[PDB]
């Protein structure tokens, strides 16, 4: 007796634009703007899109299945709307239209995915994703990346490089060592002694083992150097005029602090060093005799230290943005450190190169220039210089670019604004990849520029149609989807919203409709209501097409109904077929009167599904283990030899993946089951990380950085509010914390009542009130609430006071009938006064003409 609308406001891979065009987006890599380099990255996204899982899963999470499910939900919603058409022909016409348009497009995309996989995969370009040991980007995808305007790969030169690069057309490329994977031992690479990478590494820490000092002093270290530049080693705050030298130093320090602050952030202009954060006045007595910190003849700097510590807040220090280059360390005192910075520098050059490419200033490969001499060595030197002096590293690089701006394919060098744009991107993106296992390559996207690459749901993606067109080589025409790619290009941005507002508005429009209906009834405006109900949409559909059990009752049982009924008869501007519709739907005295179904939609469809997200994690663990074992050679045979610790850890990853997988297989999944598996999985991953940490000895293990990533992902899942859950039992997307709150209602009859109630009755305060009731008290309240919109909070809501409020309203509503009957003379005064006493005790739904006739007899 309730219609539950099942089309979700969100679906993996599915974007719906403002003109209701369905766009499916094939993902290339996971991330926004930049995607991290991990053994499996590009793999996981594609594998999932095309097949639910590489193996050990159902086809449940593929694009085809997910779209087929979406398709089914629409068909259910359409069938439901149609069920209401028998009662009110216009019912939900706008929604029905929108839902049919999406249905038809969804169906077409599904055929294409079916077709592409069967007819146009003869070389096994898709298939290899799930079978081949190290999956490759498909051909279509590589073509899309090559031809892109807003997305590019950059290849870097870390010391321990990995030859299995996925991106074959980097914009930025530098010379790399011979990967350990091209050596027989497979344990360390063969270094090369030319190139930018070697020049940076060897310069920042040479084979003489002579460290490079990192002397960065700011901002307090800087201010203390500038203020002490004017003072001597000897002078104290002593002599006859001790308060005056103090006050001068406080003013001088104050001035220099606000001066270096505004340069960094002009917004801390009115700060005082003459009073502490409490509000008490800073003076000689206060620092020497009340706190005891600074004695008499204390040094100038210790006075400065203490003034600062007493007056300044802890937040302000370190307030200014920090370069990725300055991580805090004293000096570059090992090889590990040198590579961290080699890569940092390389990545900055990569980022500048990217800026210059997306902005059409150059088409060149900056790395092809900086690997050549003298440039390789000269930039490595200037950087080492810079670190010792503590200077800003970023401009050193920009200056050298400007110094050779023509050689790098630019007409003008980089402006000060352009330079800051680059620096800030470099900062954002480096911090994202700071803890990447690998630094071989990175795919970077710009969604604020036009091109063939997009950003949707935390995936960097291409249009599925672009990939399809290309994979089939133009053979299968798109039919009605042939204009769709264009349509998306024609958009405002390439950064697409994670949820689909067009769908969400479909429902919000219904909510808005009841809200108005509720308002106009409370303001007792029957003529405006009737006008609002016949008012049309741009498609000409009258507003009464959004009537449902809730609103139909609100009107039918209202005091303004007789006024509304009169307005209805006495009106000419409204066609008779709607004039009947309305009287049929809202006059309970009409013999053709029939009740519409109640209407609901999920309040949590816009959130990512728990199971979908877990699947991605399981899938990622499997892949990692698989491509890891496929990257070792020629040592496949048992056994270690220390083989087990590396190998039993990989067995441990699969164990987790299998377990998460079997967790998902279960229907009737509960908050506590999920939480329990997820922590037990987190702990296993934690032990693995711990086992590695001890072993050393000491080398940074890529696997450690990989398990950390997976643990974090699983930690994110424990915030179950951020996800929704498909209940297979009730076929609806719910929240596990709403089911918690519903379950916390003891008695099953009361609980069900509360569930069947409108959304306004599903808040926390309300369910507490309702659990102080019994099944008979509950149904009385339910009926009560169906008569006129009221909110139940704790305050002000009294169970007793409510049992006076119900009777009042029952009696008021039912009198409408009795007064009508005695005016008609359809009842004796015998039964009029007998019923008039009964009026406050009988639910209006049961207080009807037939019932009275039956009742008297």
Author numbering: 8 to 864
Q: What do the study authors state?
A:
Crystals were also obtained with a truncated form of SidC (aa 1–871, from here on referred to as SidC871) in which 46 residues were deleted from the C-terminus. These crystals diffracted up to 2.9 Å and the structure was solved by the molecular replacement method using our previously determined SidC (aa 1–542, SidC542) crystal structure as the search model. The final refined model contains two molecules of SidC in the asymmetric unit and each molecule contains all residues from 8 to 864. The crystal structure of SidC871 reveals that SidC comprises four distinct domains: the N-terminal SNL domain, the INS domain (which is inserted within the SNL domain), the P4C domain, and a C-terminal unknown domain named CTD. These four domains are packed in a single arch-like shape with the P4C and the CTD domains in close contact with the SNL domain. Unlike any other known PI(4)P-binding domain, the P4C domain of SidC comprise a four α-helix bundle and the PI(4)P binding site resides in a highly positively charged pocket formed at one end of the bundle. A pocket is created at the other end by two loops (L1 and L2) connecting α1, α2 and α3, α4, respectively.The calculated electrostatic surface potentials revealed that this pocket is highly positively charged and it is the only area clustered with positive charges in the domain. The interaction between the P4C and SNL domains is mainly mediated by extensive hydrophobic interactions between residues L629 and I633 of the P4C domain and a hydrophobic patch consisting of residues V50, I53, A60, I140, and P141 near the ligase catalytic site on the SNL domain. However, C46 in SidC871 is shifted away from H444 by about 6 Å.
